[PDB]
Amino acid sequence: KIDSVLPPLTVREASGVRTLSFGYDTSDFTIINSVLSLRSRLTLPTYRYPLELDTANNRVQVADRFGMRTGTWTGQLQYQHPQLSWRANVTLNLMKVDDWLVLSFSQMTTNSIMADGKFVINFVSGLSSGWQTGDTEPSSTIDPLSTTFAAVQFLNNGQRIDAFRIMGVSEWTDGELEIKNYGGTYTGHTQVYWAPWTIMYPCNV
Amino acid sequence: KIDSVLPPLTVREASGVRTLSFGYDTSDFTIINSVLSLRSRLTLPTYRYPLELDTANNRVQVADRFGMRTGTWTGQLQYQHPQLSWRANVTLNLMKVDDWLVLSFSQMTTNSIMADGKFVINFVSGLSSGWQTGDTEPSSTIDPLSTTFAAVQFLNNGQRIDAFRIMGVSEWTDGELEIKNYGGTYTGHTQVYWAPWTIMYPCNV
Amino acid sequence: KIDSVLPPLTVREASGVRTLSFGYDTSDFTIINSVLSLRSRLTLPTYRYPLELDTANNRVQVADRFGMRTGTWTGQLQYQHPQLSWRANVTLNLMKVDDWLVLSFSQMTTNSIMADGKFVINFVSGLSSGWQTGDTEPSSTIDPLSTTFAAVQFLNNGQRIDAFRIMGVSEWTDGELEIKNYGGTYTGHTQVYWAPWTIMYPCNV
Ligand SMILES: CC(=O)N[C@H]1[C@H]([C@H](O)[C@H](O)CO)O[C@@](O[C@H]2[C@@H](O)[C@@H](CO)O[C@@H](O[C@H]3[C@H](O)[C@@H](O)[C@H](O)O[C@@H]3CO)[C@@H]2O)(C(=O)O)C[C@@H]1O
Ligand SMILES: CC(=O)N[C@H]1[C@H]([C@H](O)[C@H](O)CO)O[C@@](O[C@H]2[C@@H](O)[C@@H](CO)O[C@@H](O[C@H]3[C@H](O)[C@@H](O)[C@H](O)O[C@@H]3CO)[C@@H]2O)(C(=O)O)C[C@@H]1O
Ligand SMILES: CC(=O)N[C@H]1[C@H]([C@H](O)[C@H](O)CO)O[C@@](O[C@@H]2[C@@H](O)[C@H](O)O[C@H](CO)[C@@H]2O)(C(=O)O)C[C@@H]1O
Numbered sequence: 001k002i003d004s005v006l007p008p009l010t011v012r013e014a015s016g017v018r019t020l021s022f023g024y025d026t027s028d029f030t031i032i033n034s035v036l037s038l039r040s041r042l043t044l045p046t047y048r049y050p051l052e053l054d055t056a057n058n059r060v061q062v063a064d065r066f067g068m069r070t071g072t073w074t075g076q077l078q079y080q081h082p083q084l085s086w087r088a089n090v091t092l093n094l095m096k097v098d099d100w101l102v103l104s105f106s107q108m109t110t111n112s113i114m115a116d117g118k119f120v121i122n123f124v125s126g127l128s129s130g131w132q133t134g135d136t137e138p139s140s141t142i143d144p145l146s147t148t149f150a151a152v153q154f155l156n157n158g159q160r161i162d163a164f165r166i167m168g169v170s171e172w173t174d175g176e177l178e179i180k181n182y183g184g185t186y187t188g189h190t191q192v193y194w195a196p197w198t199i200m201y202p203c204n205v
Numbered sequence: 206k207i208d209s210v211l212p213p214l215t216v217r218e219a220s221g222v223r224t225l226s227f228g229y230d231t232s233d234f235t236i237i238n239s240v241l242s243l244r245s246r247l248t249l250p251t252y253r254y255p256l257e258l259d260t261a262n263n264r265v266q267v268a269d270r271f272g273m274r275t276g277t278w279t280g281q282l283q284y285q286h287p288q289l290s291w292r293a294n295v296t297l298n299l300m301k302v303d304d305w306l307v308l309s310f311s312q313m314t315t316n317s318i319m320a321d322g323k324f325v326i327n328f329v330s331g332l333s334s335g336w337q338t339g340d341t342e343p344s345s346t347i348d349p350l351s352t353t354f355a356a357v358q359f360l361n362n363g364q365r366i367d368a369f370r371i372m373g374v375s376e377w378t379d380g381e382l383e384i385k386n387y388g389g390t391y392t393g394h395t396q397v398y399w400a401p402w403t404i405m406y407p408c409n410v
Numbered sequence: 411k412i413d414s415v416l417p418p419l420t421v422r423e424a425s426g427v428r429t430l431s432f433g434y435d436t437s438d439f440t441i442i443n444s445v446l447s448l449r450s451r452l453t454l455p456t457y458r459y460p461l462e463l464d465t466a467n468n469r470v471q472v473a474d475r476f477g478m479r480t481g482t483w484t485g486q487l488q489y490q491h492p493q494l495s496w497r498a499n500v501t502l503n504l505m506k507v508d509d510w511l512v513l514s515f516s517q518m519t520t521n522s523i524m525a526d527g528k529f530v531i532n533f534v535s536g537l538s539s540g541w542q543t544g545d546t547e548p549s550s551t552i553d554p555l556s557t558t559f560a561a562v563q564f565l566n567n568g569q570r571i572d573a574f575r576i577m578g579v580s581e582w583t584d585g586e587l588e589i590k591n592y593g594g595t596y597t598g599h600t601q602v603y604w605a606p607w608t609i610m611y612p613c614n615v
Contacts, residue, residue, distance in 0.1 A: 001412060001413070001414075001421065001428065002207060002412060002421060002428060002429075002430045003427040003428045003429060004427060004428075004429045004430070005429065005430045005431075006429060006430070006431045006432075007441055007444035007445070008432055008441060008444060008445050008446045009430060009431065009432055010444070011207065017208045017209060018206060018207055018208045018209075019207075019208060019209040019210070019211060020207050020209070020210045020211070020214060021210075021211040021214065022211070022212075022213050022214050022227070022432065022446070023444055023445040023446065024445050024446045024447075025442065025445050025446060025447040025448070028446075028447055028448045028451070029446065029448075031212050031213060032230070033230075034212035034213065034215065034228055035212070035213055035228040035229050035230050036213040036227070036228060036229045036230065036233075036234070036241075036446075037229075037230040037233055038230070038233045041233065042247065042452060042454065043468060044247060045463065045468045045469055045470050046467070046468065046469045046470075047469065047470050047471070048464070048469050048470070048471035048472070050472060051256075051461075051470055051471060051472060053250065054253070057251070058248055058250045058251065059250055059251045059252065059253050060250050060251070060252050060253070060256055060265075060470075061252070061253035061256060062253070062255060062256060064409075066304075067304035067344060067407070067409035068304065068344040068345055068407055068409055070345055070347065093347045095345055095347060095407060097304050097305065097344075097407045098303050098304050098305075098508050099476075099477040099478070099507050099508050100507065100508075102351070102407070104347050104348075104349055104350070106348075107387075139477060139478040139507075140478055140480055140505055142480065142503045142505060142514050143514075143516075143606075144514060144606045144607075144608055145514070145608070146512070146608045147558070147605075147606060147607045147608045148352070148353075149354045149369075149371070149559050149561075149574075151354075151369075151371035151387060151388055151389050153388075162388065162389060162390045162391060163390075164354070164369065164389075164559075164561070164574065166559070166561035166605055166607075168606055168607075168608075182517075182561060182605040182606060183561055183563075183572065183605060184561050184572060184574075185572045185573075186572060195371055195387035195388055196348075196349045196352060196373055196387060197349075197352045197371075197373075198349055198350070198351045198352045198373075202477070202478055202505060202507045202512070204474075204477035204478055206411060207411055207412055208411070210412075216411075216412060218413075222413050222414065223411065223412055223413035223414070224412075224413060224414045224415070224416055225412050225414065225415045225416070225419060226415070226416045226419065227416075227417075227418050227419055227432065236417055236418065237435065239417035239418065239420070239433055240417070240418055240433035240434050240435050241418045241432070241433065241434045241435065241438075241439065242434075242435040242438055243435065243438040243439075246438070247452065249452060256461075258455065259458070262456070263453060263455045263456065264455055264456045264457065264458050265455050265456070265457050265458070265461055265470070266457070266458035266461060267458075267460060267461060269614075271509075272509035272549060272612070272614035273509065273549040273550055273612055273614055275550055275552065298552045300550055300552060300612060302509050302510065302549075302612045303508050303509050303510075307556070307612070309552050309553075309554055309555070311553075312592075353557070353558075354559045354574075354576070356559075356574075356576035356592060356593055356594050358593075367593060367594060367595045367596060368595075369559070369574065369594075400576055400592035400593055401553075401554045401557060401578055401592060402554075402557045402576075402578075403554055403555070403556045403557045403578075
């Protein structure tokens, strides 16, 4: 039947007995259970967010949402001072940009404030869909995480007086974000007009 | 002749017939068009920017430009108010840091301004090489995207008066960036000296 | 002995002699030194920081420290002006967030200052463990890299006068960071109370 044999196939006549064998690369293959098997089958790694595998085009990429994720918080902005405290209905815009959380305040009119004080935002409830309270937790306990200025107008018996307020992100406790108002320029007033302002802090959730 | 046969190769006599055959692992291989073929050939993924494959060292990395990309815009800064509007020749420095665009203003001397108003930057033309107009488009329509303060000196005509201006990134339309000046401290003046200032906004291009 | 063969094996006959041969997918395999060898052995890429391979779960991810790395600098904050200069003992908090370096100043009381001037931070020494001087080098030479406002109180014979100071990150030279105080509101004073403030600049180290 079989006259000759071509590689990988070879016939070795050792001890007057002709034996047929299959030749293979030792580092590539191995015989297990009397079959040709691959030595070291390479398993492809998985990817943790913000890295993702686009299975449709077999491409690894940074998730789009990582650069920008929007949301809103609806609740009551709490002003706190031992001698004066109030609640104002606000809706603030939120945006996750990389490892930062940005809060955007639109203009607002509030009751009067003391020379210094605290603003508290309770994220326990009020977040738009897709957002969890934990998503607003800062990635550091350093105080302050960031400071910004808010431009205001103090209303005092008809006259509008331009001033500023310095605001610092200082604490986060069980979903309550605390923004300290260290001070700034001040005058006796009845009401405050706040121009829009943004504040951001590190957040890796 | 052929006396013996070593694995993967095996001989089986069944139904008075002796048939030789090649022994293979069924999860590693198969037979396609009567030849040994690999089952499940693993294809290596490609990478979308800012991820890149350094082919020279077979290493996946984040592109260097992602952390920092510089540029300049040369044009006319437009101040807009219904009762007053002007154009000033400026060159502002630009830097792309991750998913942020930073605009850096050098000191400047401009005509007088109203208590509030708009600054417009037309990116349709004026960008340095490598930059396209689309590269300045914000990644969100939230208003404001960011706010900052600019320190100014109002020339009363006899005296130089220190004040501030609050600036907010508010809109981008077909290459025109709009920076609103909500207000701040103010006095009657002939001209404005602006100290340097920076403003940044989210941008994922 | 051997009655017949089966695929991959074939016994083809030509030119008067019958020969046994092994069949293979020519794209998948080849013969090298008369042995079955695979073509195109896939080599897995390595990863450059902030990308890393979690070997335990065979997963590629962004390093945790990339989003947040804390530290402290302890030294003397140097104020510089041709007609006045001093040194104050400070400890400032530092945080690396992505490609940004954030400096956090706690409240401080310093000696009096001129209408404008420079603040210098010498990172050559004073950094907490894990931090090198090179880690504070900006990723661009643009001036200013960033500006912020500091809220101050000018102390002049017991009276406290609220004002602001504009601060810009302007230069880094051999470990010395320079923060220019372009100006802001001012009055004659003997000492300055500074509210807390943060400033950040691009840094890809
Ligand atoms: C940060 C923020 O949420 N800013 C709002 C603020 C604050 O909610 C508020 O001033 C804090 O004290 O209010 C602004 O005006 C809105 C406010 O007056 C509410 C009160 O009901 O009405 C909104 O519009 C109403 C309108 O009053 C109705 O007559 C109408 O039928 O429906 C509208 C629904 O929107 C005001 O826009 C403010 O500028 O003071 C808007 C800020 O965005
Ligand atoms: C943001 C920005 O671009 N700031 C510039 C500003 C503004 O261009 C300007 O003040 C807006 O009104 O100008 C600063 O000064 C430059 C300005 O006066 C221009 C006017 O020609 O000249 C520049 O230097 C010239 C110099 O005037 C010529 O005599 C000389 O032959 O060439 C020089 C270089 O072209 C001024 O630097 C300003 O300080 O207000 C500089 C800002 O960076
Ligand atoms: C940024 C910083 O390090 N801030 C410190 C600050 C400065 O060290 C200092 O005021 C610069 O002049 O000091 C603070 O605390 C002070 C002590 O450092 C000082 O030894 O004693 C002071 C009272 O006698 C004061 O308590 C401050 O000014 O509050 C603390 C701050 O974090």
